[PDB]
Design a protein around this ligand. Structure first.
Ligand SMILES: [Ca+2]
Ligand SMILES: [Ca+2]
Ligand SMILES: [Ca+2]
Ligand SMILES: [Ca+2]
Length: 152
């Protein structure tokens, strides 16, 4: 049921004093205390480490629902469509999106990124740490971000 999703995002925005869309250490601990859970800085942190998939440092609604109900955060597209888009991005078609390909693509997209913005897009979407982005990390990234724009 998506009404469950709705109530969860409402609780989120309530405990998100900053309304930036991401929960911090203090807000996560305060929510968990609101539900009557004594969180140790250790628990609070292990939790953050279990959810922060983009390594941002803050827990976003997608990460929250991913720690809680893994398959509730569901992809809005299909693997064939996302494969077409990943082909659009990986121009050399080697199966990996380099920072060069990502920058050239975002340039075609009129998004004049900076070295720091591209580093963040890689540091956020790259999981296996090779510096590029394969199709699995690509789908992870777009599904985590699409789910955020749907419920934020
Ligand atoms: Ca926050
Ligand atoms: Ca995060
Ligand atoms: Ca490439
Ligand atoms: Ca990678």
């Amino acid at each position: 049921g998506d009404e469950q999703l709705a109530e969860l995002r409402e609780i989120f925005r309530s405990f998100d004093q900053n309304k930036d869309g991401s929960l911090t250490e203090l807000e996560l601990g305060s929510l968990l205390r609101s539900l009557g859970l004594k969180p140790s800085q250790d628990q609070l942190d292990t939790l953050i480490q279990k959810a922060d998939r983009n390594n941002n440092g803050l827990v976003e609604f997608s990460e929250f629902v991913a720690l809680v109900e893994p398959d509730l955060v569901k992809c809005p597209y299909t693997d064939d469509q996302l494969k077409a888009i990943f082909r659009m991005f990986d121009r050399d078609g080697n199966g990996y999106i380099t920072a060069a390909e990502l920058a050239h693509s975002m340039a075609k997209l009129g998004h004049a990124l900076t070295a720091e913005e591209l580093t963040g897009m890689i540091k956020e979407a790259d999981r296996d740490g090779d510096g590029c982005i394969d199709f699995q990390e690509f789908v992870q990234a777009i599904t985590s971000a699409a789910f955020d724009n749907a419920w934020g």
